[PDB]
Symmetry: D2
Subunit: 462 residues, 4 copies
């Protein structure tokens, strides 16, 4: 059962129960692309915040009756309270401006406002979608404003806290293991010693530089397009609208949003989305290396490296009974792979602005929100289910430490490089110890070898 | 309300009405990454087919009783018939083998078989998840089989016919517009004439080459890992299982699946996924250009090219009243940018196999199906709501054709490049016509100009 | 010292001894971007062939006098014999059509033909760069023609032989190692057995599939734009020129070139470059894996896996004396990482056609030829200096084989998954053997265990 | 001709007159991959600065005699004055550590030092390449140090100044065209007016945001690995060496380099190269969009947009006489396509560290330096030959603007969206002005229309 709704193109049958109208219904039917309602909820939420703000600003500046503000406000509160989730059926793969999702908001607010005020759904709303709910706005400044609200919110409320969480565990493990001496590997080959603490201090430092790099991008990301309207000029905005609607968004979200310095840059590009996503990819490449190291170190438990123990959360294998695998490592490496591809998509799209508008907005927003959410989720999963539980396998570490022929490196400043190399080659060829061959070649006394080749004194300077 | 299921790690509380067991539930709780149940339904379907196939093969080779085959068979039928979708809650971002989704089928199939046979959830299944439903199988060979079944089925039944549909529209437009003489543009600058039909024949040709590139990758994609089990060796497989189970998958799917030539290549790599997705990315880069040319050609009405007219499907703009946008073009360019990204992800994951197993299966699987589906969807949408409706802007085409100073190129073989170059530069600097300056420079008679410079004669 | 050359835009000081003229000199001065003369020689060599074929076709079809054909052929023969390599100073980062490089061929051929014929540099050439050397031609068809010649030549003469050679070594090793039983690793954890032969047969299969995938893309790539001229219409070409010039190029190169089926596709895209480079990229990603497995398999010699011994070609380390690294594996992984980003560049540029011409020709050409050359060079280097010399570390393989608790998988069909899991978990927890704990649990007798748990019998069907 | 040099692996025939030794010759022969001597000159230069710094630090802390420092500094001073370019024959695609290039420096410094001291090639060098030139160093800390010196130097001396120079032209253009009203385009369709100045202000803003994003990465980039040695522990360094060698590098370069906070991160990753290249790729995608806009705006000159005039630097076309193309825009869009690809390679290699060492150092070095150099060179080129000469085509701007039906947007706040859409659709169907139809539909008076619809007032707020 459908009712008739109208736009400036003609009449459309709209499902009789739904708060949306003609332009929403056209979009729902004209873009059967991927799964239904794929436009991210975070973008709808951000729309709820900015549409409330536009109404509060427009009232303060004298161009919208308080009555209309109050009704738009209450409708926006209901969107924000996840009361109207089923009134947003549009996909990412629509018009590249997000005009159709902007009109999905305008139409649902107008009709929901009509019913709140005691009207019948289907009757001309007391609130006009374009003239009232969209007053002083474009899809061109609202959709970018929704993008930066959702993006900033997800980065500062989910992603950075989740990455800080893992960073703190890695630094905690660096201190916890500060006295466990293990063998270095370079090129996958036996190297000189370092503590398991030092190894983990690398991982902790990678995420600290990652957090800094993301934080460096937030000033650009907090700038909002709202007030540039169609082409950036602020056509049909009241004087002072730009600064005042930003203040309202800042106050509703509790986050430090300002009006964009340049509305042309803010419509014609998503450079801020590229800058922040670049930082998300940097952390993601770091996380890949960290998770890869942890699975290498935990490999075995008999025929691999086996230097660390990790929590055993589930049966690893349907055919190999008793197998346990590093599954959180794998989930982390898979997300990191996802973020690299998302970075290609965002980078490509970010180049493809024409004149006064970039019309890759939905695809940039969906890819950015996915990276930001998945990095958050997997950092929490990995910390809870792997990183907090990492412990050293003491005897395996000792066996692999005492084994390295490259312990010989401690004799470099005593007998020089060429003589140290003779010892290592000779031990290697003969299947003997460094100590045996240092003595046999008469290059070092038993005494001096035992004084000089001490792993625990090789993990700092002279 | 929960009930106790057991795995070889101990007891787990399971939602008492759900057909899954200990291992599904651990995964559901341990992998809270992205939206719930993100594992593609195409993979769950692929699993329905191969789990049925496994059971039928195992009974044929003497290692599974018929009674147990029929119960597994029935449960798989219900999975294919979309009766058990709520029984599959696991995410892409699980173990990189897909072990947890393989154990999701094994556990669901076993418990549902018990109930089909007259049992109750909460009792020991007459069918063992591992010894019976997972007989002669590993996560390592079933999950890549699922991947190829799903990938091959999406490409031949959805992606190719959608691309074929748009290709024939573009060829039909190339013939319909064969007599429409328009100006060519190179470097975005005015050039020599071609027909609109000729321009459209380039787009038609692009998707025909793209259709061949995709078809070339099908022989590798049609090959299935099933029979390699743990490491590629076929450990715990009966002799002849590899070929027999491929035949049942072929039969059940109606599609030409064969056993993989090398089960070690089939487990350690997803080079078939990289091969076929490179071809989807080729088609996507073509589609981007076509979609971009079409919105360039339709740009205006005043401030652009405006050489074609496109269907006007919806109001373009919440603030600019009456504006109409090439919105199907923009959906097609946004899909193409997604697929390029999906190619970076798949290529990177494809490189990261270790020893006997590539454990990036689900992210490669998810990114593949997304590219295949969205290319399918956007080609149908674009054909329906744009390509089928394109028509020339007849007066606009003639105005822009007759205005090109690079019509002077017709004079090359008569007066040489240098003399031709003087006519076009004098016309441009004086804001006059080629003809007026050919006469004022004394390089061409009026009568020779009119004979030699005929746009219709410059299109071959 | 300079001389004056002229183009349609005015007078230019040209280095007095060089055979290029005004347009080549303008491009050399106006595009100071990266190293001088970066335009690949393979593109100049392709231009040498197609310029000769164009002169020959033009005379056969009555529009170029034989005398001018002969002088052009001789200048073109000098370019192909590498006698004029210093006459091409233009960069990749010029006009997106490669117009400047086409005019570099036209100017050099014209001025060289003039001197061959007895004239001097500084005089007006008896052969006009545009009217004669460029007759029946555009940059828009010559440059893509140069790209396909250079690419197809490089793929069939260098890339495919290189990969075939390494494929054959890997097939040989598969046969040589067919009876060497080693432990499989899944998720990096101890799995069930396979032969070192089986593992290597995987590597051999990956490169056969990759060769098939490159070869599938050749039919598209052997199609030449030559004949489309300015926009694809073949304006200013005599009837039959497209087929005739393709035949001369087939003959001069000895490679199966044909005229493009659609000259609009041949000018407005380089989808054939995108098609073939995606196959090169497929191969690069397979090579990454093979190279990474081999260094993983060689790791140690005590702290790693160390199942294979590889050729030791040089000292590994300036500070760690006697260290030897898998350096060929590293070159292969680094090239694979280069090819993936080359594919990002080619795809992006692939999408960015406008109307009748794609003007990213040089960046596509350079990235393609680099990938094809590097893949060939590293497969040859890796075959000679690593793959040919790989041998098993037999005793290390035996140790790592016998220590795997997942040998218990052989018991699945005898006692079940749950009973087999009990044995492996008990062995793990106790630091004991499968065999001990199989007897200890009354699950399996000595005799049956010794019968059923045979690694040599776990590398095939039941 | 040859002489014998020796390494810990044996005797090598070295070209008699070359200052390199056994390890450089091995590498030269063992890695025949891509053109000869591909390792960037900037990496060798960086090595020059750091080897001299190491020698001075080593003397100050009493572990190298002043006499040996003086010789190392003299050989280092010959590398830095570009006198020994022919002594560095090694390729990018070597060992993934850059070991062979580290030993190339050590060998050439040793032997050139020996000859400077009055010795002869073929003699044992007075200075040992491992014990003296490489004292208190690994390849694992010197190669990353070379990379950061090279990367930091290139970005702040070439890339930032080039980008700043172009930004300043786009800002001067924004101010020069502040009063020129032109038609907006959104989705490539007629939109509302903005000034040509406001449009250029977007371009200027993009480069300003890009410059800030690049500078935010400099703090991480100026950290040097030097002092970490083999695995990061500073094994075989004297106390204070890390800090003191950083001061010498800062002194000799004149740039504020500091010792890395975490030497394990400085060896096991190139996260700082990922961080800075991300910012470079941001600026490239911005430059792509700017260059594409300028070529769209300049297109025609009679059957495109044609709103702006760009300088005419060369004949555009070999067949179409008098054609002139936007060739500098093309060079910039191709470089941008190159940098995006470079970002993929760098991101991939950045993820692929194992344990204590990332062994993709050369490929990350080469791709970084290419991006930084090409972005500098094309920004200077585009500025000099394109952007400084951009002028309005005033009559053509007015022609395309006065036309626009979306000037109707000025009526929204007076009559509402639905009435404004009637006017626009009726003018469109009838091919009449907005004014005629506004009056004729009885929706707006002549007086009110002329008052409310003023293009010049549509470039700002109500």
């Amino acid at each position: 059962a459908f009712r008739i709704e109208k736009d400036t193109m003609g009449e459309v049958q709209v499902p009789a129960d739904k708060y949306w109208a003609a332009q929403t219904e056209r979009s729902r039917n004209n873009f059967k692309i991927g799964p239904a309602a794929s436009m991210p909820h975070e973008i709808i939420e951000a729309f709820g915040y900015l549409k409330k703000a536009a109404a509060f600003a427009n009232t303060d500046l004298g161009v919208l009756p308080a009555e209309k503000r109050d009704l738009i406000g209450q409708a926006c509160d209901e969107i924000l309270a996840r009361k109207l989730d089923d009134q947003f059926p549009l996909v990412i793969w629509q018009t590249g401006s997000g005009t159709q999702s902007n009109m999905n908001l305008n139409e649902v607010i107008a009709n929901r406002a009509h019913v709140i005020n005691g009207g019948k759904l289907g009757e001309k709303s007391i609130i006009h979608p374009n003239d009232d709910v969209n007053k002083s706005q474009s899809s061109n400044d609202t959709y970018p404003t929704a993008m930066h609200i959702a993006a900033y919110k997800k980065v500062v409320e989910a992603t950075i806290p989740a990455v800080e969480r893992l960073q703190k565990t890695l630094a905690a493990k660096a201190a916890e293991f500060k006295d466990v001496v293990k063998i270095g590997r370079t090129h996958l080959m036996d190297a000189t010693p370092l503590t398991l603490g030092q190894e983990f201090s690398g991982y902790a430092a990678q995420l600290s530089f990652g957090l800094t790099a993301i934080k460096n991008t937030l000033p650009h990301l907090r700038q909002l397009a709202l007030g540039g309207t169609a082409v950036g000029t602020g056509l049909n905005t009241p004087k002072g609208y730009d600064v005042k609607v930003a203040e309202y968004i800042a106050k509703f979200t509790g986050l430090p949003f300002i009006t964009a310095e340049n509305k042309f840059e803010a419509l014609a590009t998503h450079d801020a989305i590229v800058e922040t996503h670049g930082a998300l990819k940097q952390v993601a490449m770091s996380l890949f290396k960290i998770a890869n190291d942890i699975r290498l170190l935990a490999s075995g438990p008999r025929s691999g490296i086996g230097e660390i123990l990790i929590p055993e959360n589930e049966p690893g294998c349907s055919i190999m009974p008793g197998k346990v695998n590093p599954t959180q490592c794998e989930a982390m490496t898979m997300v990191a792979a996802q973020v690299l591809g998302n970075d290609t998509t965002i980078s490509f799209a970010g180049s493809q602005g024409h004149f006064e508008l970039n019309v890759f907005k939905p695809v940039m927003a969906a890819n950015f929100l996915q990276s930001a959410q998945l990095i958050a989720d997997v950092c929490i999963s990995f910390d809870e289910h792997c990183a907090t539980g990492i412990q050293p396998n003491t005897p395996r570490i000792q066996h692999l430490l005492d084994s390295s022929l490259m312990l010989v490196t401690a004799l470099n400043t005593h007998i020089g490089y060429e003589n140290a190399a003779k010892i290592a080659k000779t031990a290697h060829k003969n299947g003997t110890t460094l100590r045996e061959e240092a003595i046999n070649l008469g290059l070092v006394s038993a005494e001096d070898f035992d004084k000089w080749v001490v792993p625990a004194d090789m993990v700092g300077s002279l």
